[PDB]
Amino acid sequence: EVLFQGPMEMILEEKDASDWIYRGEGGANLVLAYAGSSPLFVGKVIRIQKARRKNSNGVVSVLTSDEQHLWRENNELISSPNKEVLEQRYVQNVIIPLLGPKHVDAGVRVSVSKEFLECVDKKVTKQRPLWRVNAANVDTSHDSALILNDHSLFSQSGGDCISVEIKPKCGFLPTSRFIGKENMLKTSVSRFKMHQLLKLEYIEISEESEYDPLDLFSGSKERVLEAIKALYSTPQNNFRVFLNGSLILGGSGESTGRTSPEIGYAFEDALKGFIQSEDGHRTECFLQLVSDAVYGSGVLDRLLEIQKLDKLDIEGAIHCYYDIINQPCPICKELSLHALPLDESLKIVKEYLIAATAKDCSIMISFQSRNAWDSEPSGDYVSLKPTNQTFDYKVHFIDLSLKPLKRMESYYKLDKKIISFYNRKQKAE
Ligand SMILES: Nc1ncnc2c1ncn2[C@@H]1O[C@H](COP(=O)(O)OP(=O)(O)O)[C@@H](O)[C@H]1O
Ligand SMILES: O=c1c(O)cccc2cc(O)c(O)c(O)c12
Ligand SMILES: [Mg+2]
Ligand SMILES: [Zn+2]
């Protein structure tokens, strides 16, 4: 019998920085994969908050007063001390009751020192997209991070692990009575298709995408495989494929261009030893695999129901927003929405923000080939007949983030700019 220290929370220090390597980033977070030898972290990633270069006391504020009231239904949620606890609690107490816990497993919090976040910042700057380093770096005045399972790995070997990420976007067309007569194309063209035109105007993509979200969310196995083939053709930032955690198709921390014959030949070859098919045929087999696992899993049906919590479109919901923040409505100048009880205006706005989490999130699908000698069977698999192979798979949601109340104004101005530009571009017959 020996004396042990009393329980204490783990803090990561300069030593532990080198055990992580750049994986990717979006607008809010940097993500790193564990390249070390500890069993705690094998097959994990860490999610670190970026800084884009407070209440009535000078003390910084986690949620604004309006946000505390909007989300007051859960007392723990609005009591969150930092953004890491807020995100755990949002996923645990808001999202998982709506999606289920099978395809969601929130993270585990961990503390970090300032030198750790200075190491990670210097470490990754070389592998980040340049316009990302222009706009944001690691927030080194923070003291927490989130640990999560690495969903590009099937097993927390003797055979490659191949996985895909799909950012599916909004899969339905609005039916709101609050969409004005001039804007009726919003009822027949998807937001994603109209948005493409504006992205081209701003040099953010090089070609219009072939992908249509109404296909992927249709419930038709023919339409679904068609969407997967369009994603492969024009991935932009909606499709990525990893081999043992390393990217082999799509953009790194950013969107990318069309799959050229040269790209396709390289990808066709990277699939050797996962798909057992003669040369020039593995790609066709792999896209059927992804399609079958997306449709067979069923995960998109419940996701679409959360998106449809946006019931009035932003053209309706924006009026409830201006009641919430006790402001004269700039849009009007309507005694319908503005005559609602406070509690109903609040519910509409809150469900709008929840819908946005589901319109903005991603799905990661990892695969295990039973060809490998150390594979283990499960109840979730796809049988590839043209290849006489069986692949087990897992599906998980990522980026289930709480949206800030004040972005409501941004949502409205982008929408107005999308539909106006599309309207103009089509007038030119
Ligand atoms: N849990 C995870 N497992 C594996 N890869 C992940 C995981 N979470 C994020 N990533 C990768 O890192 C990227 C950025 O993460 P994300 O949380 O979307 O950042 P942001 O919140 O800034 O959009 C993702 O697009 C994905 O490729
Ligand atoms: O393209 C995006 C988009 O089209 C819509 C909505 C949210 C996004 C959020 C991100 O963090 C990001 O990097 C994006 O690239 C997008
Ligand atoms: Mg993201
Ligand atoms: Zn109004």
Side-chain angles (χ1 to χ4, degrees), residues 59-91:
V59 186
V60 196
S61 186
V62 57
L63 292 185
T64 71
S65 283
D66 289 331
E67 290 179 323
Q68 289 173 355
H69 196 82
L70 183 69
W71 299 102
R72 61 191 195 291
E73 169 80 280
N74 192 262
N75 287 303
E76 329 158 17
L77 180 65
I78 63 156
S79 306
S80 300
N82 57 42
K83 226 165 183 315
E84 274 73 24
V85 179
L86 184 80
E87 170 115 11
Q88 287 185 297
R89 289 180 175 177
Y90 186 64
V91 175

PDB file of all heavy atoms in Angstrom, residues 59-91:
ATOM      1  N   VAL A  59     -16.757  42.424 -16.920  1.00  0.00           N
ATOM      2  CA  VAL A  59     -16.425  41.006 -16.975  1.00  0.00           C
ATOM      3  C   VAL A  59     -16.978  40.405 -18.260  1.00  0.00           C
ATOM      4  O   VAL A  59     -18.120  40.678 -18.653  1.00  0.00           O
ATOM      5  CB  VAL A  59     -16.979  40.280 -15.735  1.00  0.00           C
ATOM      6  CG1 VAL A  59     -16.510  38.830 -15.712  1.00  0.00           C
ATOM      7  CG2 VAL A  59     -16.572  41.008 -14.463  1.00  0.00           C
ATOM      8  N   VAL A  60     -16.164  39.583 -18.931  1.00  0.00           N
ATOM      9  CA  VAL A  60     -16.630  38.943 -20.155  1.00  0.00           C
ATOM     10  C   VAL A  60     -17.883  38.117 -19.856  1.00  0.00           C
ATOM     11  O   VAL A  60     -18.136  37.695 -18.719  1.00  0.00           O
ATOM     12  CB  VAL A  60     -15.533  38.072 -20.789  1.00  0.00           C
ATOM     13  CG1 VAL A  60     -15.885  37.744 -22.240  1.00  0.00           C
ATOM     14  CG2 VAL A  60     -14.181  38.769 -20.694  1.00  0.00           C
ATOM     15  N   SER A  61     -18.676  37.887 -20.901  1.00  0.00           N
ATOM     16  CA  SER A  61     -19.989  37.270 -20.766  1.00  0.00           C
ATOM     17  C   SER A  61     -20.099  36.086 -21.716  1.00  0.00           C
ATOM     18  O   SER A  61     -19.783  36.213 -22.905  1.00  0.00           O
ATOM     19  CB  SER A  61     -21.099  38.294 -21.050  1.00  0.00           C
ATOM     20  OG  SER A  61     -22.383  37.754 -20.797  1.00  0.00           O
ATOM     21  N   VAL A  62     -20.555  34.944 -21.191  1.00  0.00           N
ATOM     22  CA  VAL A  62     -20.688  33.736 -22.001  1.00  0.00           C
ATOM     23  C   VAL A  62     -21.916  33.813 -22.902  1.00  0.00           C
ATOM     24  O   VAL A  62     -21.842  33.542 -24.105  1.00  0.00           O
ATOM     25  CB  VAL A  62     -20.730  32.486 -21.102  1.00  0.00           C
ATOM     26  CG1 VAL A  62     -21.882  32.581 -20.088  1.00  0.00           C
ATOM     27  CG2 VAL A  62     -20.853  31.232 -21.970  1.00  0.00           C
ATOM     28  N   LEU A  63     -23.068  34.127 -22.328  1.00  0.00           N
ATOM     29  CA  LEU A  63     -24.307  34.347 -23.055  1.00  0.00           C
ATOM     30  C   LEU A  63     -24.795  35.754 -22.755  1.00  0.00           C
ATOM     31  O   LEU A  63     -24.670  36.228 -21.621  1.00  0.00           O
ATOM     32  CB  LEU A  63     -25.397  33.339 -22.638  1.00  0.00           C
ATOM     33  CG  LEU A  63     -25.267  31.855 -22.979  1.00  0.00           C
ATOM     34  CD1 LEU A  63     -26.522  31.104 -22.580  1.00  0.00           C
ATOM     35  CD2 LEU A  63     -25.017  31.680 -24.471  1.00  0.00           C
ATOM     36  N   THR A  64     -25.356  36.423 -23.761  1.00  0.00           N
ATOM     37  CA  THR A  64     -25.976  37.718 -23.502  1.00  0.00           C
ATOM     38  C   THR A  64     -27.261  37.531 -22.704  1.00  0.00           C
ATOM     39  O   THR A  64     -27.798  36.420 -22.590  1.00  0.00           O
ATOM     40  CB  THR A  64     -26.294  38.444 -24.809  1.00  0.00           C
ATOM     41  OG1 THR A  64     -27.381  37.772 -25.457  1.00  0.00           O
ATOM     42  CG2 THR A  64     -25.092  38.446 -25.726  1.00  0.00           C
ATOM     43  N   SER A  65     -27.762  38.647 -22.149  1.00  0.00           N
ATOM     44  CA  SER A  65     -29.003  38.600 -21.380  1.00  0.00           C
ATOM     45  C   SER A  65     -30.135  38.043 -22.221  1.00  0.00           C
ATOM     46  O   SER A  65     -30.915  37.199 -21.756  1.00  0.00           O
ATOM     47  CB  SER A  65     -29.384  40.002 -20.862  1.00  0.00           C
ATOM     48  OG  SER A  65     -28.585  40.353 -19.754  1.00  0.00           O
ATOM     49  N   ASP A  66     -30.268  38.544 -23.459  1.00  0.00           N
ATOM     50  CA  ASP A  66     -31.293  38.024 -24.357  1.00  0.00           C
ATOM     51  C   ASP A  66     -31.109  36.532 -24.597  1.00  0.00           C
ATOM     52  O   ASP A  66     -32.095  35.814 -24.765  1.00  0.00           O
ATOM     53  CB  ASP A  66     -31.278  38.777 -25.698  1.00  0.00           C
ATOM     54  CG  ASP A  66     -31.801  40.212 -25.581  1.00  0.00           C
ATOM     55  OD1 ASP A  66     -32.642  40.485 -24.696  1.00  0.00           O
ATOM     56  OD2 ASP A  66     -31.377  41.071 -26.383  1.00  0.00           O
ATOM     57  N   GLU A  67     -29.861  36.048 -24.625  1.00  0.00           N
ATOM     58  CA  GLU A  67     -29.635  34.625 -24.873  1.00  0.00           C
ATOM     59  C   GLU A  67     -29.985  33.786 -23.644  1.00  0.00           C
ATOM     60  O   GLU A  67     -30.590  32.715 -23.778  1.00  0.00           O
ATOM     61  CB  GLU A  67     -28.185  34.393 -25.308  1.00  0.00           C
ATOM     62  CG  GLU A  67     -27.893  34.935 -26.718  1.00  0.00           C
ATOM     63  CD  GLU A  67     -26.449  34.735 -27.163  1.00  0.00           C
ATOM     64  OE1 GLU A  67     -25.526  34.844 -26.334  1.00  0.00           O
ATOM     65  OE2 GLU A  67     -26.226  34.458 -28.364  1.00  0.00           O
ATOM     66  N   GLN A  68     -29.633  34.267 -22.435  1.00  0.00           N
ATOM     67  CA  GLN A  68     -30.060  33.578 -21.216  1.00  0.00           C
ATOM     68  C   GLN A  68     -31.565  33.368 -21.203  1.00  0.00           C
ATOM     69  O   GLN A  68     -32.046  32.299 -20.818  1.00  0.00           O
ATOM     70  CB  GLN A  68     -29.646  34.365 -19.968  1.00  0.00           C
ATOM     71  CG  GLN A  68     -28.164  34.354 -19.680  1.00  0.00           C
ATOM     72  CD  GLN A  68     -27.791  35.288 -18.537  1.00  0.00           C
ATOM     73  OE1 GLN A  68     -28.629  36.031 -18.007  1.00  0.00           O
ATOM     74  NE2 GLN A  68     -26.525  35.264 -18.159  1.00  0.00           N
ATOM     75  N   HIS A  69     -32.327  34.366 -21.648  1.00  0.00           N
ATOM     76  CA  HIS A  69     -33.784  34.246 -21.614  1.00  0.00           C
ATOM     77  C   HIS A  69     -34.290  33.328 -22.714  1.00  0.00           C
ATOM     78  O   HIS A  69     -35.210  32.532 -22.488  1.00  0.00           O
ATOM     79  CB  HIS A  69     -34.459  35.624 -21.722  1.00  0.00           C
ATOM     80  CG  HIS A  69     -35.905  35.618 -21.314  1.00  0.00           C
ATOM     81  ND1 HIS A  69     -36.310  35.697 -19.994  1.00  0.00           N
ATOM     82  CD2 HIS A  69     -37.040  35.511 -22.051  1.00  0.00           C
ATOM     83  CE1 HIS A  69     -37.632  35.646 -19.939  1.00  0.00           C
ATOM     84  NE2 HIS A  69     -38.099  35.537 -21.173  1.00  0.00           N
ATOM     85  N   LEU A  70     -33.692  33.418 -23.908  1.00  0.00           N
ATOM     86  CA  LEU A  70     -34.109  32.570 -25.021  1.00  0.00           C
ATOM     87  C   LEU A  70     -33.972  31.089 -24.681  1.00  0.00           C
ATOM     88  O   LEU A  70     -34.816  30.274 -25.077  1.00  0.00           O
ATOM     89  CB  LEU A  70     -33.285  32.898 -26.283  1.00  0.00           C
ATOM     90  CG  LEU A  70     -33.683  32.106 -27.556  1.00  0.00           C
ATOM     91  CD1 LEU A  70     -35.042  32.563 -28.026  1.00  0.00           C
ATOM     92  CD2 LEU A  70     -32.653  32.226 -28.701  1.00  0.00           C
ATOM     93  N   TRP A  71     -32.893  30.717 -24.004  1.00  0.00           N
ATOM     94  CA  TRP A  71     -32.580  29.322 -23.719  1.00  0.00           C
ATOM     95  C   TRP A  71     -32.925  28.907 -22.275  1.00  0.00           C
ATOM     96  O   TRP A  71     -32.545  27.806 -21.861  1.00  0.00           O
ATOM     97  CB  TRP A  71     -31.087  29.054 -24.009  1.00  0.00           C
ATOM     98  CG  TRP A  71     -30.682  29.303 -25.443  1.00  0.00           C
ATOM     99  CD1 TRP A  71     -30.012  30.395 -25.949  1.00  0.00           C
ATOM    100  CD2 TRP A  71     -30.934  28.436 -26.555  1.00  0.00           C
ATOM    101  NE1 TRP A  71     -29.836  30.244 -27.321  1.00  0.00           N
ATOM    102  CE2 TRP A  71     -30.402  29.057 -27.709  1.00  0.00           C
ATOM    103  CE3 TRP A  71     -31.568  27.195 -26.688  1.00  0.00           C
ATOM    104  CZ2 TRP A  71     -30.491  28.476 -28.972  1.00  0.00           C
ATOM    105  CZ3 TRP A  71     -31.648  26.618 -27.930  1.00  0.00           C
ATOM    106  CH2 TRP A  71     -31.113  27.259 -29.064  1.00  0.00           C
ATOM    107  N   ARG A  72     -33.678  29.737 -21.523  1.00  0.00           N
ATOM    108  CA  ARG A  72     -33.879  29.528 -20.083  1.00  0.00           C
ATOM    109  C   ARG A  72     -34.541  28.192 -19.737  1.00  0.00           C
ATOM    110  O   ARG A  72     -34.478  27.764 -18.584  1.00  0.00           O
ATOM    111  CB  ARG A  72     -34.725  30.677 -19.498  1.00  0.00           C
ATOM    112  CG  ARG A  72     -36.106  30.759 -20.126  1.00  0.00           C
ATOM    113  CD  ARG A  72     -36.856  32.042 -19.763  1.00  0.00           C
ATOM    114  NE  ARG A  72     -38.268  31.891 -20.095  1.00  0.00           N
ATOM    115  CZ  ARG A  72     -38.734  31.824 -21.340  1.00  0.00           C
ATOM    116  NH1 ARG A  72     -37.901  31.923 -22.370  1.00  0.00           N
ATOM    117  NH2 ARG A  72     -40.034  31.663 -21.566  1.00  0.00           N
ATOM    118  N   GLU A  73     -35.177  27.532 -20.701  1.00  0.00           N
ATOM    119  CA  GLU A  73     -35.786  26.226 -20.467  1.00  0.00           C
ATOM    120  C   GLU A  73     -34.846  25.241 -19.762  1.00  0.00           C
ATOM    121  O   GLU A  73     -35.312  24.381 -19.003  1.00  0.00           O
ATOM    122  CB  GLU A  73     -36.253  25.653 -21.809  1.00  0.00           C
ATOM    123  CG  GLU A  73     -36.672  24.207 -21.784  1.00  0.00           C
ATOM    124  CD  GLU A  73     -38.070  24.019 -21.243  1.00  0.00           C
ATOM    125  OE1 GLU A  73     -38.240  24.031 -20.003  1.00  0.00           O
ATOM    126  OE2 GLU A  73     -39.002  23.870 -22.064  1.00  0.00           O
ATOM    127  N   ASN A  74     -33.532  25.331 -19.998  1.00  0.00           N
ATOM    128  CA  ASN A  74     -32.563  24.479 -19.303  1.00  0.00           C
ATOM    129  C   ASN A  74     -31.670  25.346 -18.428  1.00  0.00           C
ATOM    130  O   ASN A  74     -30.844  26.108 -18.940  1.00  0.00           O
ATOM    131  CB  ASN A  74     -31.718  23.653 -20.273  1.00  0.00           C
ATOM    132  CG  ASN A  74     -30.927  22.561 -19.569  1.00  0.00           C
ATOM    133  OD1 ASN A  74     -29.739  22.720 -19.272  1.00  0.00           O
ATOM    134  ND2 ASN A  74     -31.595  21.451 -19.273  1.00  0.00           N
ATOM    135  N   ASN A  75     -31.813  25.206 -17.107  1.00  0.00           N
ATOM    136  CA  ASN A  75     -31.075  26.070 -16.196  1.00  0.00           C
ATOM    137  C   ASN A  75     -29.581  25.802 -16.254  1.00  0.00           C
ATOM    138  O   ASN A  75     -28.782  26.735 -16.135  1.00  0.00           O
ATOM    139  CB  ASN A  75     -31.620  25.916 -14.776  1.00  0.00           C
ATOM    140  CG  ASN A  75     -32.967  26.564 -14.628  1.00  0.00           C
ATOM    141  OD1 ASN A  75     -33.113  27.773 -14.884  1.00  0.00           O
ATOM    142  ND2 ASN A  75     -33.980  25.773 -14.280  1.00  0.00           N
ATOM    143  N   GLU A  76     -29.174  24.543 -16.446  1.00  0.00           N
ATOM    144  CA  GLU A  76     -27.744  24.257 -16.540  1.00  0.00           C
ATOM    145  C   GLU A  76     -27.140  24.902 -17.783  1.00  0.00           C
ATOM    146  O   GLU A  76     -26.025  25.431 -17.739  1.00  0.00           O
ATOM    147  CB  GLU A  76     -27.493  22.745 -16.568  1.00  0.00           C
ATOM    148  CG  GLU A  76     -28.491  21.880 -15.807  1.00  0.00           C
ATOM    149  CD  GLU A  76     -28.502  20.435 -16.305  1.00  0.00           C
ATOM    150  OE1 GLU A  76     -27.533  20.020 -16.992  1.00  0.00           O
ATOM    151  OE2 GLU A  76     -29.488  19.714 -16.023  1.00  0.00           O
ATOM    152  N   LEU A  77     -27.856  24.847 -18.906  1.00  0.00           N
ATOM    153  CA  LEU A  77     -27.355  25.434 -20.146  1.00  0.00           C
ATOM    154  C   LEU A  77     -26.988  26.902 -19.962  1.00  0.00           C
ATOM    155  O   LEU A  77     -25.877  27.324 -20.298  1.00  0.00           O
ATOM    156  CB  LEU A  77     -28.403  25.281 -21.242  1.00  0.00           C
ATOM    157  CG  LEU A  77     -28.014  25.862 -22.601  1.00  0.00           C
ATOM    158  CD1 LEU A  77     -26.820  25.091 -23.194  1.00  0.00           C
ATOM    159  CD2 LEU A  77     -29.207  25.805 -23.538  1.00  0.00           C
ATOM    160  N   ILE A  78     -27.915  27.712 -19.430  1.00  0.00           N
ATOM    161  CA  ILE A  78     -27.633  29.142 -19.350  1.00  0.00           C
ATOM    162  C   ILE A  78     -26.709  29.480 -18.195  1.00  0.00           C
ATOM    163  O   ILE A  78     -26.287  30.635 -18.079  1.00  0.00           O
ATOM    164  CB  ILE A  78     -28.934  29.972 -19.289  1.00  0.00           C
ATOM    165  CG1 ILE A  78     -29.747  29.664 -18.027  1.00  0.00           C
ATOM    166  CG2 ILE A  78     -29.765  29.743 -20.554  1.00  0.00           C
ATOM    167  CD1 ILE A  78     -30.678  30.795 -17.621  1.00  0.00           C
ATOM    168  N   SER A  79     -26.350  28.500 -17.362  1.00  0.00           N
ATOM    169  CA  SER A  79     -25.360  28.677 -16.305  1.00  0.00           C
ATOM    170  C   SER A  79     -23.948  28.294 -16.740  1.00  0.00           C
ATOM    171  O   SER A  79     -23.044  28.248 -15.896  1.00  0.00           O
ATOM    172  CB  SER A  79     -25.755  27.853 -15.080  1.00  0.00           C
ATOM    173  OG  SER A  79     -27.084  28.157 -14.663  1.00  0.00           O
ATOM    174  N   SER A  80     -23.740  28.018 -18.027  1.00  0.00           N
ATOM    175  CA  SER A  80     -22.447  27.510 -18.493  1.00  0.00           C
ATOM    176  C   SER A  80     -21.353  28.555 -18.282  1.00  0.00           C
ATOM    177  O   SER A  80     -21.510  29.706 -18.708  1.00  0.00           O
ATOM    178  CB  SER A  80     -22.527  27.117 -19.973  1.00  0.00           C
ATOM    179  OG  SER A  80     -23.508  26.106 -20.173  1.00  0.00           O
ATOM    180  N   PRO A  81     -20.234  28.192 -17.640  1.00  0.00           N
ATOM    181  CA  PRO A  81     -19.164  29.172 -17.388  1.00  0.00           C
ATOM    182  C   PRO A  81     -18.320  29.529 -18.608  1.00  0.00           C
ATOM    183  O   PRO A  81     -17.903  30.682 -18.738  1.00  0.00           O
ATOM    184  CB  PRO A  81     -18.314  28.485 -16.310  1.00  0.00           C
ATOM    185  CG  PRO A  81     -18.614  27.031 -16.451  1.00  0.00           C
ATOM    186  CD  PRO A  81     -20.050  26.956 -16.861  1.00  0.00           C
ATOM    187  N   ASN A  82     -18.041  28.567 -19.493  1.00  0.00           N
ATOM    188  CA  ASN A  82     -17.268  28.814 -20.706  1.00  0.00           C
ATOM    189  C   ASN A  82     -17.928  28.108 -21.887  1.00  0.00           C
ATOM    190  O   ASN A  82     -18.843  27.298 -21.722  1.00  0.00           O
ATOM    191  CB  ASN A  82     -15.802  28.364 -20.550  1.00  0.00           C
ATOM    192  CG  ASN A  82     -15.664  26.893 -20.162  1.00  0.00           C
ATOM    193  OD1 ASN A  82     -16.365  26.017 -20.678  1.00  0.00           O
ATOM    194  ND2 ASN A  82     -14.747  26.622 -19.245  1.00  0.00           N
ATOM    195  N   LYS A  83     -17.448  28.422 -23.095  1.00  0.00           N
ATOM    196  CA  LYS A  83     -18.059  27.892 -24.312  1.00  0.00           C
ATOM    197  C   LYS A  83     -17.965  26.375 -24.412  1.00  0.00           C
ATOM    198  O   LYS A  83     -18.812  25.761 -25.071  1.00  0.00           O
ATOM    199  CB  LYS A  83     -17.415  28.531 -25.543  1.00  0.00           C
ATOM    200  CG  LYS A  83     -18.424  29.000 -26.588  1.00  0.00           C
ATOM    201  CD  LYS A  83     -17.797  29.946 -27.615  1.00  0.00           C
ATOM    202  CE  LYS A  83     -18.838  30.445 -28.598  1.00  0.00           C
ATOM    203  NZ  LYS A  83     -19.699  29.319 -29.057  1.00  0.00           N
ATOM    204  N   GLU A  84     -16.967  25.755 -23.769  1.00  0.00           N
ATOM    205  CA  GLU A  84     -16.848  24.302 -23.819  1.00  0.00           C
ATOM    206  C   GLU A  84     -17.992  23.625 -23.080  1.00  0.00           C
ATOM    207  O   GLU A  84     -18.541  22.623 -23.556  1.00  0.00           O
ATOM    208  CB  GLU A  84     -15.506  23.863 -23.233  1.00  0.00           C
ATOM    209  CG  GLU A  84     -14.358  23.868 -24.216  1.00  0.00           C
ATOM    210  CD  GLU A  84     -13.885  25.261 -24.566  1.00  0.00           C
ATOM    211  OE1 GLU A  84     -14.103  26.188 -23.755  1.00  0.00           O
ATOM    212  OE2 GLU A  84     -13.282  25.429 -25.654  1.00  0.00           O
ATOM    213  N   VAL A  85     -18.343  24.139 -21.896  1.00  0.00           N
ATOM    214  CA  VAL A  85     -19.448  23.575 -21.131  1.00  0.00           C
ATOM    215  C   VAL A  85     -20.774  23.874 -21.823  1.00  0.00           C
ATOM    216  O   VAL A  85     -21.685  23.040 -21.838  1.00  0.00           O
ATOM    217  CB  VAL A  85     -19.412  24.120 -19.687  1.00  0.00           C
ATOM    218  CG1 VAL A  85     -20.570  23.581 -18.865  1.00  0.00           C
ATOM    219  CG2 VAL A  85     -18.072  23.801 -19.020  1.00  0.00           C
ATOM    220  N   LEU A  86     -20.905  25.072 -22.400  1.00  0.00           N
ATOM    221  CA  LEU A  86     -22.111  25.426 -23.148  1.00  0.00           C
ATOM    222  C   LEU A  86     -22.367  24.428 -24.270  1.00  0.00           C
ATOM    223  O   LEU A  86     -23.482  23.913 -24.418  1.00  0.00           O
ATOM    224  CB  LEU A  86     -21.974  26.842 -23.708  1.00  0.00           C
ATOM    225  CG  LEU A  86     -23.195  27.394 -24.426  1.00  0.00           C
ATOM    226  CD1 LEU A  86     -24.190  27.880 -23.378  1.00  0.00           C
ATOM    227  CD2 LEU A  86     -22.803  28.522 -25.376  1.00  0.00           C
ATOM    228  N   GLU A  87     -21.322  24.107 -25.039  1.00  0.00           N
ATOM    229  CA  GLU A  87     -21.468  23.180 -26.161  1.00  0.00           C
ATOM    230  C   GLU A  87     -21.812  21.769 -25.691  1.00  0.00           C
ATOM    231  O   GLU A  87     -22.698  21.119 -26.268  1.00  0.00           O
ATOM    232  CB  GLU A  87     -20.197  23.184 -27.019  1.00  0.00           C
ATOM    233  CG  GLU A  87     -20.163  22.069 -28.086  1.00  0.00           C
ATOM    234  CD  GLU A  87     -20.185  22.593 -29.520  1.00  0.00           C
ATOM    235  OE1 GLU A  87     -20.023  23.818 -29.724  1.00  0.00           O
ATOM    236  OE2 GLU A  87     -20.357  21.768 -30.452  1.00  0.00           O
ATOM    237  N   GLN A  88     -21.123  21.260 -24.657  1.00  0.00           N
ATOM    238  CA  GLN A  88     -21.525  19.971 -24.089  1.00  0.00           C
ATOM    239  C   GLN A  88     -22.997  19.988 -23.708  1.00  0.00           C
ATOM    240  O   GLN A  88     -23.726  19.015 -23.937  1.00  0.00           O
ATOM    241  CB  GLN A  88     -20.719  19.621 -22.826  1.00  0.00           C
ATOM    242  CG  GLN A  88     -19.298  19.196 -22.949  1.00  0.00           C
ATOM    243  CD  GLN A  88     -18.727  18.791 -21.581  1.00  0.00           C
ATOM    244  OE1 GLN A  88     -18.633  19.614 -20.674  1.00  0.00           O
ATOM    245  NE2 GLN A  88     -18.368  17.512 -21.428  1.00  0.00           N
ATOM    246  N   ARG A  89     -23.436  21.076 -23.058  1.00  0.00           N
ATOM    247  CA  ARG A  89     -24.782  21.110 -22.506  1.00  0.00           C
ATOM    248  C   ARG A  89     -25.824  21.320 -23.593  1.00  0.00           C
ATOM    249  O   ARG A  89     -26.905  20.724 -23.534  1.00  0.00           O
ATOM    250  CB  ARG A  89     -24.870  22.191 -21.423  1.00  0.00           C
ATOM    251  CG  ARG A  89     -24.098  21.803 -20.150  1.00  0.00           C
ATOM    252  CD  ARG A  89     -24.170  22.868 -19.043  1.00  0.00           C
ATOM    253  NE  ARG A  89     -23.510  22.401 -17.821  1.00  0.00           N
ATOM    254  CZ  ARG A  89     -23.353  23.118 -16.711  1.00  0.00           C
ATOM    255  NH1 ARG A  89     -23.810  24.363 -16.631  1.00  0.00           N
ATOM    256  NH2 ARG A  89     -22.736  22.578 -15.672  1.00  0.00           N
ATOM    257  N   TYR A  90     -25.526  22.161 -24.588  1.00  0.00           N
ATOM    258  CA  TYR A  90     -26.397  22.256 -25.765  1.00  0.00           C
ATOM    259  C   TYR A  90     -26.612  20.886 -26.414  1.00  0.00           C
ATOM    260  O   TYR A  90     -27.750  20.458 -26.639  1.00  0.00           O
ATOM    261  CB  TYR A  90     -25.805  23.249 -26.780  1.00  0.00           C
ATOM    262  CG  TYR A  90     -26.675  23.549 -27.993  1.00  0.00           C
ATOM    263  CD1 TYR A  90     -27.915  24.182 -27.857  1.00  0.00           C
ATOM    264  CD2 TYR A  90     -26.247  23.231 -29.276  1.00  0.00           C
ATOM    265  CE1 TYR A  90     -28.711  24.464 -28.967  1.00  0.00           C
ATOM    266  CE2 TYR A  90     -27.036  23.515 -30.395  1.00  0.00           C
ATOM    267  CZ  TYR A  90     -28.257  24.125 -30.234  1.00  0.00           C
ATOM    268  OH  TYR A  90     -29.025  24.402 -31.341  1.00  0.00           O
ATOM    269  N   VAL A  91     -25.530  20.184 -26.738  1.00  0.00           N
ATOM    270  CA  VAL A  91     -25.690  18.862 -27.352  1.00  0.00           C
ATOM    271  C   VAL A  91     -26.414  17.911 -26.414  1.00  0.00           C
ATOM    272  O   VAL A  91     -27.320  17.180 -26.825  1.00  0.00           O
ATOM    273  CB  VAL A  91     -24.325  18.296 -27.781  1.00  0.00           C
ATOM    274  CG1 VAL A  91     -24.488  16.882 -28.308  1.00  0.00           C
ATOM    275  CG2 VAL A  91     -23.700  19.198 -28.826  1.00  0.00           C
TER     276      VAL A  91
END
